[PDB]
C-alpha cells in the first residue's frame, strides 16, 4: 500500500536516500571496473549485466560534474526525495507532462517555477 | 475447432489457407511489379557474405526468369495452384529457369511482397493525412509563410514513399517523416477525428532557423554523397556562427557556444535521418565493412584450440565479404556467450601509415565544405565539420553497423537451414531396396549383457515374426569355452529362422563398431545356406539406426507394439526403413515436431525454428508428390497414412478427412473420379491432388463392378486422359479408345514411333498452349506407370560406415586433435612396437614407441599400463580399419610451433594475441 | 525504482579462515551472499557499495563456526504500484508486449493498452499499432509504463505494467 499517489512509505525509505539513474550507472560501472581487475573472482551475475546495460542506455547525465550540479539544483527546492528522483530520472519535457506523470506534483508547487526547474533539467542534459 | 471444418470444406489448397497472409488474386500490373521485385531481391541479389549455391535439383538466371516468376505467381495467386502442381504439370510455364525448389522461393518471396505492399499503403494514408492537416494552417492564413519548423510535405516525400523497394528503405522514409512531422501527428489525430527526445528542444528554442544557415539542406548534402562531389555548393553567410548564435541565445541556450552546440545537433540528426544519406551509406557499409574481434577476459581462457571460436579468436580488418557459410553465426554465438566482442566498421583499425588510409568521414568532409580562407568561412567550416562528425559516429555508423550485422547473421542462419534441407532430401531420395519384400531387421544395444532382437516384416511392413538371440553379441572366437557354446547356439537358431522365413534382406543397426562383427556372423550364416544351395542369397546391409532410435523413443511405437521391448521395436523400424525410407521418415516424423530431434546440422538449434521447419517439410512435399501416394494402401495399412498430408493441395486436415469418408463407406478409392462423386472434393483441390494420387487398378480386380480407368495408375493428370488415349490410338496406327490404351501399355515399344512434335502444334492450333513437355511425360507414363524416380539403394561406403559406427565427422575427428584414449595392451611383433589404445568411439589407437615420450624409451611397460588413460594427439586416421596413429609426447602436446593446431583465420590478429598473453605473464 | 539503503547480514565462518585474511574473507562472503538476491521487503539488491562495520563475531558452542553481523550499504531496485518508469521492449507478440525494467520483467495486457492500439498478427514483426500509426512499438523500443501489480515468485518479485494513461508511449 505504498505508492507515489499516496506517498505513505515505510520507515526504510524514510531512513534511506534515493539515487538517480545516472548516479547508479556511475556507481555500477565503477564496481564493474573494480571487479574486472579482480582475478579468480566469481564473475558478475548476468542480472547485473542486464541492469548495467539498462542504466547506461537511459542515463540522462553523462559526467559526475553534471550529476553534482543537478543534485545541488534539486536540493535547493523543498522537494521530497521520491518526487526529486522520479523527475530527474524520467526528465519530463513539459510541465503538463510532469503533472500527468507524477500526480503528487500537481497542487503542490506553482507551474511557472515548475517550468523553470524543468527547463533547468533540460539545460543540464548535454 | 470450427476452423478445421471450414478448411475441410473450402475448395483451396490447405497450405494456401493456412498461410498467415491470405492469398489474393493479383492483377497483371501487380504481377509484373511483384515478379520484377521478387527476381531482384530473391535471385539477382548476391549475398554480402560468401554463400555457395545450395541448388541440388540441377543435374544464376537472367531477366528471362522474370516472366517465369510471373507465370508462377499467376498460377498461385490467381489459379490457386500449389508449388508441386506447377512444378509437375505446368513445367512449360516455369521451366527451365524455375524448378520446384525455386518455385518455393518465389512462393516464399510472394508473401514478402504482399506485406511490403500493405505497409506502403498504410504509410501513404499517414502521409496524406499529414499533408492535409498541415495544409489546414496554410488554408486559413495562406499569406503567412510557413515557419522554419514546418517543413513542406511535398509530393517528393510522397513519391519517395511510393519508390520504396525494401523494408530498410521504408524505415528511412518513416524515420525521416517522424523527425519533422512526428510531433504534430497527435494534433493531426484529434483534428481528423473531430472533423470526421533531444530533437524537440532545438525546435522549441528556434535553433531550426539557425540550422538552415549552415550551408546545405539534408537532401542537398545527400546528393553530394551520392555523386561523390560538390554537386551543390554550400551557401556562405556573412555573420560568423557565434554572431548568429547570440541572436538565438535564451534561457535554454545561454552561451553562444551552447546555441551552436544545440544547432549542430539538428544538422547532424537531420543529415542522419535523410533517406538519401541513409541509402548512400547503406551501400557504402556493404562494400567496405570490416569485422574486428577481441576476446573478453572470459574468452581469453575459455577459447582453447578445441573451441569453435578458436579460428576467429582474434580478427583484425576482416571484410564482411570474406565471411563464408555460417562463420558469422559462430562469431555471434561466441559473442552471445561473452567470449568475444565484435565491431563492424568501414575504416581500418591499427593500420596507420597505409596508403589511402583516410576514413570515410574525411572523404566526404569536402562534400559539405567551403573552399575559402576567410575567417568566417573557417568558423562555419569548423561548425559544418562537427555536425557531420556527429552525424556519422553517433547515428549513421551505429545504425548501419547494426543493420549489417542482422543482414550478415540472417545469411549465416539461412545457410544452416539450407544444410538441414540438403540432409533431409538425401534421406528421402533413397529408393526401395531391390534384391539382386521380406526384411529381417536386427538391432542390438551397446551393452554386453543386452540381447539381440530380430524383427521380420512382410512386403507391406507388417511384423510377422521375431527372433531373440541372448548371446549373439558374444564372439564365436572367444577363448572361454562357454561363450563359444553360448554364441554357437544362437547362430543355429538364426540359421533355422532364416531357412524357413527366407527374408530377402537382413538389416543390422549401425549402433557401434560391434555392428561389423554381427554383419560377419549374419553373412557367414547366409553363406552356409548358399554354399549348399538350400537357400538363395540373402542380402546383408548396414543401416543407420538414428531414425530407428527415434521410433523406439516415440510413443507411437508403444501403441503399435505394447509388448515389444525397445530393442525389438527399433528392429521393426530398421526393416521398415529399407523397404521404404520415405514412408518410415514420414511415419516416424509426426506433427509433434519429432523431426527436429534428428541431427540435421550442429547449429540447427540456433536458427529460426519456423524457417527451418518450413524448409524441411518442403522436401517431404516435393518427394511425396514425386513418388505419389496410394490411398488404398494407406487404408489397409494405417502406418502409411502419414503420406497423404504431404500430398499437393490436401494437407493434414483434408487428408485425414479423405480417409474418414472412405473408411466410413467401407469402400476403396477405385478411381480418381470417386474423389469428387463420393468424397465431395472441390474442383480446385482435385486439380492439385488428382495427378499425385495413385490407385492400383490391377489390385482391384473384377470385384470392382464400376468402370476402372487404367490411366488412374499413372502420373497423367485426368485433364489429359483424352490426350493419353489419343496418343495410344496413334501408336497402333488405328484407322476404340479403351482398346489401344490397354494394348499400348502391354507393348509400349510402339510409342517411340510416335511423332510427338507434330501433335504439339495441333493442341496449340486449337488453343491449348505449349505442351511438348507434357506430351513427353504422358508417353513416359505409358511406357512405365508411376516409375520410381528415386535413387537406387546402395550399401554405405567406407566413409559413411566410419561415421555411422564411430559417430564422428572430419570436423570433429581430424589429424592433430587432442583426444583421450585408454591403453588396452602393448603391440607386439619381448620385442614391442608401441602401445595399443581404444577410443571412446570404438577407434583403436596406436602410439609408436618413439612418439611415446620426449626422451628415449627403453621398455614401454613402465611408461603405461593396461587401462591407463594417456592424452594423445591424432597423427593419422584410418577410417577403413577404425585405427588412428597417436602421439603422447609432452612437446607434441605443447605444440609451441602450432603445427598440430587447426588453421586460424586469415585476418587473425596475431599482434593482439601476442600482447594479450604477454601482459598476462607480467 | 532504484534505492540506496543500509542492510544487515550475518555471515558464518568456518574455522578454516581464522587466519590473517579473516576480515577480507568476511567481506568476500558478504559480497557473494547478498549480491544478486531479491526480497519482497527490500526488493532486488543490485550491488553492495560499502561495509559500514563488522561486529565482533561470536563462537557458537559445539559448532566450529563463528558468526559475524555485517551491516552493509547496498543498491536496491524496488518498483511500486502506480509508478511510471522507463522500460525496454524485449519480445513482442500477439498476446501483448514484454518489457524489462532493470532486472524486473513486465508484460502489458490488452486491457492496459489504449483502445486505439490493436493486435496485428499479419505483421512480420508483431507489434501494437493504431490505424493512424502515429506511434509504433516494436522490440528494443523505449516505453514509459505504469506499474499495476507486484507478485513475488521464488524470492523474485515480478511486476505487471501499464501504458493506458496519457503521455505514456514511445517518445
From TrEMBL, chain A:
SUPFAM superfamilies noted in UniProt: HRDC-like (SSF47819)
Stored SMART domains: RPOL4c (SM00657)
Compartments, as annotated in UniProt: Nucleus
Molecular functions (GO terms): nucleotide binding
Record-linked InterPro entries: HRDC-like_sf (IPR010997), RNA_pol_Rpb4/RPC9_core (IPR006590), Rpb4-like (IPR045222), Rpb4/RPC9 (IPR005574), Rpb4/RPC9_sf (IPR038324)
UniProt entry keywords in alphabetical sequence: DNA-directed RNA polymerase, Nucleus, Transcription
Keyword GTP-binding: no
Predominant cellular place of this UniProt entry's protein: nucleus
Similarity remark: Belongs to the eukaryotic RPB4 RNA polymerase subunit family.
Name the UniProt record assigns to this protein: DNA-directed RNA polymerase II subunit RPB4
Organism listed in the record: Sus scrofa
TrEMBL record, chain C:
Domain of life: Eukaryota
UniProt-listed Gene3D superfamilies: Nucleic acid-binding proteins, RNA polymerase Rpb7-like, N-terminal domain
GO cellular component, one term: DNA-directed RNA polymerase complex
GO molecular function: nucleic acid binding
Single GO BP term: DNA-templated transcription initiation
Coiled-coil ranges per UniProt: none
Compartments reported by the entry: Nucleus
Keywords: DNA-directed RNA polymerase, Nucleus, Transcription
S1 motif domain boundaries: 80-162
Keyword Acyltransferase found: no
Record-annotated membrane-spanning stretches: none
Family, similarity comment: Belongs to the eukaryotic RPB7/RPC8 RNA polymerase subunit family.
Record function comment: DNA-dependent RNA polymerase which catalyzes the transcription of DNA into RNA using the four ribonucleoside triphosphates as substrates.
UniProt cross-references to PANTHER family, sorted A to Z: DNA-DIRECTED RNA POLYMERASE II SUBUNIT RPB7 (PTHR12709:SF4), DNA-DIRECTED RNA POLYMERASE II, III (PTHR12709)
UniProt protein name: DNA-directed RNA polymerase subunit
Upper taxonomic lineage: Eukaryota, Metazoa, Chordata, Craniata, Vertebrata
Gene: POLR2G
Amino acid at each position: 500500500e505504498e505508492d507515489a499517489s499516496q506517498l505513505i512509505f515505510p520507515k526504510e525509505f524514510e531512513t534511506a536516500e534515493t539515487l538517480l539513474n545516472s548516479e547508479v550507472h556511475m556507481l555500477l560501472e565503477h564496481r564493474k571496473q573494480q571487479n574486472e581487475s579482480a582475478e579468480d573472482e566469481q564473475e558478475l551475475s548476468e542480472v547485473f549485466m542486464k541492469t548495467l546495460n539498462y542504466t547506461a542506455r537511459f542515463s540522462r547525465f553523462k559526467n559526475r560534474e553534471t550529476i553534482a550540479s543537478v543534485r545541488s539544483l534539486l536540493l535547493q527546492k523543498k522537494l521530497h526525495k521520491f518526487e526529486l528522483a522520479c523527475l530527474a530520472n524520467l526528465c519530463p519535457e513539459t510541465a503538463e507532462e510532469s503533472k500527468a506523470l507524477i500526480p503528487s506534483l500537481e497542487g503542490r508547487f506553482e507551474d511557472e517555477e515548475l517550468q523553470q526547474i524543468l527547463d533547468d533539467i533540460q539545460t543540464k542534459r548535454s | 475447432t470450427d476452423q478445421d471444418n471450414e478448411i475441410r470444406a473450402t475448395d483451396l489448397p490447405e497450405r494456401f489457407q493456412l498461410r498467415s497472409i491470405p492469398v489474393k488474386g493479383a492483377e497483371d500490373d501487380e504481377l509484373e511489379e511483384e515478379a520484377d521485385w521478387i527476381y531482384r531481391n530473391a535471385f539477382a541479389t548476391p549475398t554480402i557474405s560468401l554463400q555457395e549455391s545450395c541448388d541440388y535439383l540441377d543435374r544464376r538466371k537472367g531477366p528471362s526468369t522474370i516472366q517465369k516468376i510471373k507465370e508462377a505467381l499467376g498460377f498461385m495467386r490467381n489459379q490457386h495452384f500449389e508449388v508441386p502442381f506447377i512444378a509437375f504439370y505446368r513445367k512449360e510455364y516455369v521451366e527451365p529457369e524455375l524448378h520446384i525448389n525455386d518455385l518455393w522461393r518465389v512462393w516464399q518471396w510472394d508473401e514478402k511482397w504482399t506485406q511490403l505492399r500493405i505497409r506502403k499503403e498504410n504509410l501513404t494514408r499517414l502521409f496524406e493525412k499529414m499533408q492535409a492537416y498541415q495544409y489546414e494552417q496554410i488554408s486559413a492564413d495562406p499569406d503567412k509563410p510557413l515557419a522554419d519548423g514546418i517543413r513542406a510535405l511535398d509530393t517528393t516525400d510522397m513519391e519517395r514513399l511510393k519508390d520504396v523497394q525494401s523494408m530498410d528503405e521504408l524505415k528511412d522514409v518513416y524515420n525521416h517523416f517522424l523527425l519533422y512531422y512526428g510531433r504534430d501527428i497527435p494534433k493531426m489525430q484529434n483534428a481528423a477525428k473531430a472533423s470526421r527526445d533531444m530533437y524537440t528542444i532545438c525546435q522549441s528554442a528556434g535553433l531550426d532557423g539557425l540550422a538552415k544557415k549552415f550551408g546545405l539542406t539534408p537532401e542537398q548534402f545527400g546528393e553530394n554523397l551520392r555523386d561523390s562531389y560538390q554537386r551543390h555548393e554550400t551557401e556562405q553567410f556573412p555573420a560568423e556562427p557565434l554572431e548568429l548564435a547570440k541572436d538565438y541565445v535564451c534561457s535554454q541556450f545561454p552561451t553562444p557556444e551552447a546555441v551552436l552546440e544545440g544547432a549542430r545537433y539538428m544538422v547532424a540528426l537531420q543529415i542522419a535521418r535523410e533517406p538519401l544519406v541513409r541509402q548512400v551509406l547503406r551501400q557504402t557499409f556493404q562494400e567496405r565493412a570490416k569485422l574486428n574481434i577481441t576476446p573478453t577476459k572470459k574468452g581469453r581462457k575459455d577459447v582453447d584450440e578445441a573451441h569453435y571460436a578458436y579460428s576467429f579468436k582474434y580478427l583484425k580488418n576482416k571484410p564482411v565479404k570474406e565471411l563464408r557459410d555460417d562463420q558469422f553465426l559462430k562469431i555471434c554465438l561466441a559473442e552471445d556467450e561473452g567470449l568475444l566482442t565484435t565491431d563492424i566498421s568501414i575504416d581500418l583499425k591499427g593500420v596507420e601509415g597505409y596508403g589511402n588510409d583516410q576514413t570515410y568521414f574525411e572523404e566526404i568532409k569536402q562534400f559539405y565544405y567551403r573552399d575559402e580562407f576567410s575567417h568566417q568561412v573557417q568558423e562555419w567550416n569548423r561548425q559544418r565539420t562537427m555536425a557531420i562528425e556527429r552525424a556519422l559516429q553517433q547515428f549513421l555508423y551505429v545504425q548501419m553497423a547494426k543493420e549489417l550485422k542482422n543482414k550478415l547473421l540472417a545469411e549465416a542462419k539461412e545457410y544452416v537451414i539450407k544444410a538441414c534441407s540438403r540432409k533431409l532430401y538425401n534421406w528421402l531420395r533413397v529408393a526401395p531396396y531391390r534384391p539382386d519384400i521380406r526384411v529381417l531387421g536386427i538391432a542390438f544395444s551397446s551393452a554386453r549383457d543386452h540381447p539381440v532382437f530380430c524383427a521380420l516384416v512382410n512386403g507391406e511392413g507388417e511384423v510377422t515374426d521375431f527372433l531373440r538371440l541372448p548371446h549373439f553379441t558374444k564372439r564365436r572366437t572367444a577363448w572361454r569355452e562357454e561363450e563359444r557354446e553360448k554364441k554357437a547356439q544362437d547362430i543355429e537358431t538364426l540359421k533355422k529362422f532364416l531357412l524357413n522365413k527366407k527374408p530377402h534382406v537382413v538389416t543390422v543397426a549401425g549402433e557401434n563398431r560391434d555392428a561389423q562383427m554381427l554383419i560377419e556372423d549374419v553373412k557367414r550364416i547366409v553363406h552356409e545356406l548358399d554354399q549348399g544351395q538350400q537357400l538363395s542369397s540373402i542380402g546383408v546391409e548396414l543401416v543407420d539406426n538414428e531414425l530407428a532410435i527415434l521410433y523406439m523413443n516415440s510413443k507411437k511405437s508403444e501403441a503399435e507394439f505394447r509388448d515389444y521391448p525397445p530393442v525389438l521395436r527399433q528392429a521393426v523400424s530398421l526393416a521398415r526403413r529399407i523397404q521404404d525410407p520415405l514412408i518410415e521418415f514420414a511415419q516416424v516424423c509426426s506433427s509433434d515436431e519429432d523431426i527436429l530431434c534428428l541431427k540435421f546440422h550442429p547449429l540447427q538449434e540456433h536458427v529460426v525454428k519456423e524457417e527451418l521447419l518450413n524448409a524441411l517439410y518442403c522436401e517431404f512435399i516435393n518427394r511425396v508428390n514425386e513418388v505419389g501416394v496410394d490411398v488404398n494402401r494407406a487404408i489397409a495399412h494405417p502406418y502409411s497414412q502419414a503420406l497423404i498430408q504431404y500430398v499437393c493441395g490436401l494437407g493434414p486436415r483434408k487428408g485425414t478427412h479423405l480417409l474418414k469418408i472412405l473408411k466410413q463407406n467401407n469402400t476403396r478409392l477405385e478411381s480418381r473420379t470417386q474423389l469428387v462423386t463420393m468424397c465431395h472434393m472441390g474442383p480446385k483441390v482435385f486439380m492439385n491432388c488428382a495427378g499425385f494420387l495413385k490407385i492400383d487398378t490391377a489390385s482391384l480386380g473384377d470385384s470392382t463392378d464400376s468402370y476402372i480407368e487404367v490411366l488412374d495408375g499413372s502420373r497423367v493428370h485426368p485433364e489429359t486422359y483424352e490426350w493419353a488415349r489419343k496418343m495410344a490410338v496413334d501408336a497402333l496406327e488405328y484407322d476404340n479408345p479403351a482398346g489401344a490404351l490397354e494394348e499400348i501399355l502391354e507393348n509400349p515399344e510402339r510409342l517411340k514411333d510416335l511423332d510427338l512434335d507434330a501433335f504439339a502444334e495441333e493442341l496449340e492450333r486449337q488453343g491449348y498452349g505449349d505442351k511438348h513437355i507434357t506430351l513427353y511425360d504422358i508417353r513416359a507414363e505409358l511406357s512405365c506407370r508411376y516409375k520410381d524416380l528415386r535413387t537406387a539403394y546402395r550399401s554405405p561406403n567406407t566413409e559413411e560406415i566410419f561415421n555411422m559406427l564411430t559417430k564422428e565427422t572430419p570436423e570433429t575427428f581430424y589429424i592433430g586433435k587432442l583426444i583421450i584414449c585408454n591403453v588396452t595392451g602393448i603391440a607386439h611383433r619381448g620385442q614391442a612396437i608401441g602401445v595399443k589404445t581404444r577410443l571412446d568411439n570404438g577407434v583403436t589407437g596406436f602410439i609408436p614407441t618413439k612418439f611415446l615420450s620426449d626422451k628415449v624409451v627403453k621398455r614401454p611397460e613402465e611408461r603405461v599400463k593396461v587401462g591407463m588413460t594417456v592424452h594423445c594427439r591424432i597423427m593419422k586416421i584410418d577410417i577403413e580399419k577404425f585405427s588412428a596413429d597417436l602421439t603422447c609426447r609432452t612437446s607434441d602436446l605443447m605444440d609451441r610451433n602450432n603445427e598440430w593446431k587447426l588453421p586460424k583465420d586469415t585476418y587473425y590478429d596475431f599482434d593482439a594475441e601476442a600482447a594479450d598473453h604477454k601482459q598476462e605473464e607480467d | 525504482m532504484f534505492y540506496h539503503i543500509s542492510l544487515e547480514h550475518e555471515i558464518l565462518l568456518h574455522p578454516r579462515y581464522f587466519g590473517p585474511n579473516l576480515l577480507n574473507t568476511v567481506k568476500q562472503k558478504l559480497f557473494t551472499e547478498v549480491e544478486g538476491t531479491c526480497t519482497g521487503k527490500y526488493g532486488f539488491v543490485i550491488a553492495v557499495t560499502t561495509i559500514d562495520n563488522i561486529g565482533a563475531g561470536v563462537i557458537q558452542p559445539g559448532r566450529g563456526f563463528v558468526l559475524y553481523p555485517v551491516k552493509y550499504k547496498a543498491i536496491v531496485f524496488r518498483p511500486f504500484k502506480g509508478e511510471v518508469v522507463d522500460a525496454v521492449v524485449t519480445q513482442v507478440n500477439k498476446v501483448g508486449l514484454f518489457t524489462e525494467i532493470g532486472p524486473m520483467s513486465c508484460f502489458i495486457s490488452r486491457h492496459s493498452i489504449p483502445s486505439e492500439m490493436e493486435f496485428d498478427p499479419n505483421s512480420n514483426p508483431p507489434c501494437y499499432k493504431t490505424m493512424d500509426e502515429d506511434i509504433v512499438i516494436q522490440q528494443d523500443d523505449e516505453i514509459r509504463l505504469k506499474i499495476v501489480g507486484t507478485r513475488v515468485d521464488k524470492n523474485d518479485i515480478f511486476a505487471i505494467g501499464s501504458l493506458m494513461d496519457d503521455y505514456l508511449g514511445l517518445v
